[model samples]
Target: GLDVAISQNGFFRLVDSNGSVFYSRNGQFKLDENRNLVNMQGMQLTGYPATGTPPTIQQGANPAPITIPNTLMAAKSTTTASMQINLNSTDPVPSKTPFSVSDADSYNKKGTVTVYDSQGNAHDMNVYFVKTKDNEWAVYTHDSSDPAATAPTTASTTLKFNENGILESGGTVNITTGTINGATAATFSLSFLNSMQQNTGANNIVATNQNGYKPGDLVSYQINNDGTVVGNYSNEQEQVLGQIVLANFANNEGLASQGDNVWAATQASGVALLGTAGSGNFGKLTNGALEAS
Candidate 1:
């Protein structure tokens, strides 16, 4: 979960908070509150931000500070949820009874599932299933913070099974919940794959699953050999942040040493030759490792 850059045959171009540019061969690095990749002296390890398609290091006269920023996730509304269940084939269908969220006898069985909204808030949604006919079933969905006083959405989907209890059609349903906590009406596809209609006596639910989650914090700034820094978040998602850059000198012997594994460019050393690791003359990076001094 860490990344250290190496120049192979060159130095790293870094800058201090006061904007003093320096050269360093050090691989020891850490992160700051501003997500700046910094060396031990609190100087930012400079690099080019990957602002182009396919991730290109936008080189410039002044390299930008490498900041790994994919920490939190966005609040995307739940789009789909799948369910699996076993319905009793021998159960008698109620006559003229409608499926209701508050009526237990009106439906053969009910299950509740957890889902997320556009605002990232969690809501427990109720899924009601009622045997409307001998080989047909109706599915209903509902979600309201105040369930006791609110009415649920009407039947959104219907299912049909063959005589052998195998699903024939309508294995999927479009479910829309009530205005959940004032967020947009949450609509999602409810899949009923692997659902069965057997003479199991009692209807049983095997699974109730949904997609989408609340945003999470950052996990690590992992990397690749091409200097690609990937930010891992606690939400189980990874995003490419930036690529660590390398700097070479025209004259290697002309660099002035500053102890702390750092050096400075001289008139003979010329300007820092900027390039990304693993490209051109730069060296490939190693994850969570430092080269020997």
Candidate 2:
């Protein structure tokens, strides 16, 4: 329910539903029925809420409860993707046969990747590796996902490898789609990462991963030392929820605890220096720990 601070004097500010502000070294926080972060006293933890598609948190604004909603996270369109593969260097060049996805005899080997569209739809992108010459292979993407519905597209780029099997050129492949599965037409790059042509003669894909993900449900949340709260979603994605505002005083010892673990600014403590955590003289958040007096 609460966050901690690094310094022994660290504190977390709280605001009640009635709009009363309080401060305490206790960082214990929990979520209430409405998903509002609250303390044992049921006061709401305050922070600036994040807004926008690629969420961003704003500072120097009104503070409110760190509110979360039970909703599905929006799907992210894939902007970039990469994969690693071991191309068989021993695969012989097909004899006078041109590359064709329809005929397996036309290519020496194949590699495939699952890519997402703007609507979070999945598509299979296949690359037919044709052995053109020594240390070289012509890469082509065919309609491997739905062969009858789509036609094969040629990737004119030829992958060149050094004698040591390290890829030298043609490492990037561009994919262009025409609005497949209710998703907008777009293009993205699927590049090779640590791809090699080796005598291992293994045509196995080492690993495949993409940056885009389908919609996800909120699984957990966290607060950082800088007071930024992040929400983790089921899509293996994280986004900003908001940031906790830290108030500083010129003379903290002078501030009187008006009871209920809340401190009020006083003539001795000086006016609260309103700022983000770690800004000016404000202490950094320890994110779920306590500070000793």
Candidate 3:
């Protein structure tokens, strides 16, 4: 709701609803109903935006009006997860008759992998491993809310290892998230292809990976010295809306004032010399503030 002006001499490019072009140095900017950055007259503030990965300004191209997207970021469900564990082959089996979450001696090792349900709710599922015999192990998954003493038993996946400690079969297991609060049930495949059993004296799950994120909403945005409009989201993500480009005149006196801080290019102004902020002779930009008359 404030002004965005450049300290330097160049004018900001603007376009009106009727396709009429104008120039201004007032730097006054606000968002329209569509979230487009515009001046008091609703004239769009023109600039460029990155359209590819790594984010970059499309140089030497026609500048576009800065328009920030006004939609909610969709939630994503985790469909698959990867595990990286190094189970110690030298560890001895527990003396307990049956596996119990309460007793540490019942299972050889335990780990957890976080996943997202349909509504983007996060759930950390506990995974327990019990070495039934030499070169053989059983895998069980239980809810994190379950008490260790009463962790219910479900179908377990049996993992077999060769003499070299490499997994032979049962490398993948279907994980289920039953009745997550405020979200739909989610089931995904947990792959242990990157796991191995070795005599490393430590049986642990080092890391886990999944491709899902919670829902996000467009929160606010800021303009940088480079004139790029960067939008912030509630989910800790950012997007480049566009950049505010500048127009320079051959003669500073050549511009014609059209009122309301609008200027027009003329024969004397020698056509708008298009350039980006802080590039070559262009002036650097500022955000959330405007230049005084």
Candidate 4:
């Protein structure tokens, strides 16, 4: 609830990280010992933490923060991977088996994505694909390595498309593959809507489901330049737990950068338009995979 921040007023500086932007007001300033970049308050800013200097204001030349000398949780590095997946005849559509109206996502082949490790290595993982079933299709992961990196491993996910091609309200279907990098790659079950937990296939009820979905290893993630983090299991084709939301504003210039890789709202960024990934233009997500940056 308190996770969202609002920027009121004060000395606001829009730091341009070479194209992308971050707004700031906290002037506590410090340099991480590791020579990594940080904000005035000592909270480190993400996006090119190693490269690019902070933005320049009406003034010129901003000095680099002194690298944090000890290096406790200092960012080691940031990595990102990107990829493309093709939609097919068998792809499930919303109003069909999903039955809520976000199903066209199955047709969209291009998705922009981002990934992070426990150590904060931001990798831009991308995915490419082909639909194999009404609920099953083949997907592959990609990285900056390009054509030389060895074709990304092919993975297939199965969907539960209804008779009309939509997702049914409730049914336990087994995913031949296991959870992302988990035990067993054959026969796992997942159900998106179960009346037991008050999950009625309705958009509002995102509560627990009768079918248990746990924090999968290698949880899937996606961000729609708009900011929704769709987290789920990459290994288990049938499991997609939930989505972390992202927001944007008509006037982003007014927002404040709280550092430590977070942004606070200002009268500018407007209110954070929160929603589950794939619910809106947020885009569907694939775990253990990423979109084309």
Candidate 5:
């Protein structure tokens, strides 16, 4: 293999143990007993493999035989949750003197969501949106983790919206519980996306979403157009496993074949230009398909 692979600059060819080389427009591949990627003749398939949990491709280097094994996928901790919602613009201000989590009568409208910690433990987060004035609402975080607590430990959070009923600012808040539920003090961010103060006559939560995931297992795999191998997991998550590197010659006609669907570079072919799919002149990848000769 030349220093560069997978480009219009050269032809993508394969090399065998006895120094034999060949080229094939068709790739017939399977995993051997040892999980090594190989062709029908048992010749190993070569490419650049990725690394890490959500595996990112390492682009520059020597291409090697791709290998994969059944492994446990790690869990990702939640850092940020983006929620899109609407606050009723016509809701009247609360008549209660002070807001109380235990006394539902003190708050005008409320919303709740679940968030995960590093240990994959779930915690309930409750927010009360109390209308203080026109286009101004005071947001409060209630300690729902403690049912006995009468009022929220903190209720100073506030949100401001424009006359147009669009949230103007102060939607982001950091939840700091200070060591609750067997876990150390953990802080997470809440960002309201597309949240607005609309005169819809009622408070409605349109959407709520979070970014953390639990541990998962590899369920299936597929090849992408960009030459990346994607693994689908049981947790409804997908990750990269490897990438195929192709090489094209300055003069493809100058290349020589050693049979068995492989080809070798020659002086006329020039050096291989290394790049992943979609880079330079490298072509896209397709699975279970053949190119017309």
Candidate 6:
């Protein structure tokens, strides 16, 4: 543990736990019941002194004692985010390591949606989507130890958008894989907004990703480097509630890290080459999803 100074404006400075200079603006922190030390985002702050050492409050012996507080700021019980992908089944597969689509790039927006399991332990679970040869799509999860080992085979619902990019049944279609050869039946679920509800003819038996949630439960979404937010939902129907903008950094590595895994602007980092996510060499974002490792 090192020294942490938080100004009234919420500006924060973090020395290394081993003493070094690091800073950030991810201003997302929380405080414990004990207000000891915390970042603007509530993370327990740590630092290293300019001398690269913890304060020697004790000389040859303990010096004047300072009592640590017993309170902290409130915490965010939960936070939601989204990502995007551009899948073109018509596109040819690339010979590259991370496969690519030819005519149209194959983009499947999936993610390790971190959720506390039945044990209240948070874990990232893979949610994968693949456009089939027949223009249909296949979806699955691969976040477990053995992604393909025993993936839960489930049919995912589809959100058909209207001509104006709104939900429409004709333009959109619900699909189901029914079963995966090596996994359990997914029996995924579906929930959408008023626009998506019109297309609900019947639920497919095999693959359903409708993780039971109240309509309108997904209130907010997270933007990605590639532009696409797994829409904030209003119902079980997979709906494109809205659009999110993505960003790019001319020098991603140039951005300086202020510890805690956050990087910020610095002379070395240069300006953030900001742009839409998945624009050009940028990446795509899959809403309500993550990039599979």
Task: Assess each prediction's global lDDT (C-alpha) against the native.
Answer: 0.73, 0.71, 0.77, 0.33, 0.64, 0.33
lDDT tens readout by residue for model 5, 117-140 = 666665567878888889888888
RMSD per model, one decimal: 4.5, 5.0, 5.9, 20.7, 6.7, 21.3
Worst 10 residues of 2 by lDDT: 284-293
Clashing pairs in 1: none
Q: Cα miss at 166, model 4 (Å)? A: 4.6
What ranges in model 5 sit over 4 Å off? Answer: 1-35, 39-43, 51-60, 143-153, 178-181, 218-220, 232-240, 245-293
* TM-score of every prediction relative to native: 0.79, 0.72, 0.67, 0.23, 0.66, 0.25
When summed lDDT is taken over every stretch of 10 residues in candidate 6, the lowest stretch is 57-66
After superposing candidate 6, which stretches have Cα over 4 Å from the reference? 1-81, 92-110, 117-120, 133-136, 142-149, 159-293
Give the distance in Å from residue 3's predicted Cα in candidate 6 to where it truly belongs.
17
Model 4, range 1-293, lDDT digits (tens) per residue?
00112242222222333434344433233334553334544343322112223311111223222222221222222122212222234333323332111233443232324443333333333433334445443433344322233433444233333444344332333223212222322232333333121112221222321222223334323332222223234333322212223344566676676555446666766764433324453443332224321
Which 10 successive residues of model 5 have the least lDDT summed? 1-10
- lDDT tens per residue, model 2, 8-51: 45456678777877777656677678878787888777777787
Pairs that collide, model 2: 1-29, 1-30, 2-27, 2-28, 2-29, 3-288, 4-286, 4-288, 4-289, 5-286
Global lDDT of model 1: 0.73
lDDT of 3 by residue, 1-293 (tens): 74676666878889998878899888877777877778878888888866777666677667777777766668878889877788988888888857876788888988888888878777777788898889888888876742332364654588899998999998888777755554576788988887889966699788888776678443667777877778776656777778888888888688788986678988887888888777887757743432221
lDDT of model 1 at residue 98? 59
Superposed by TM-score, candidate 3 places the C-alpha of residue 255 at a distance from the truth, in angstroms, of: 1.3
Model 1: how far residue 228 lies from native, Å: 1.4
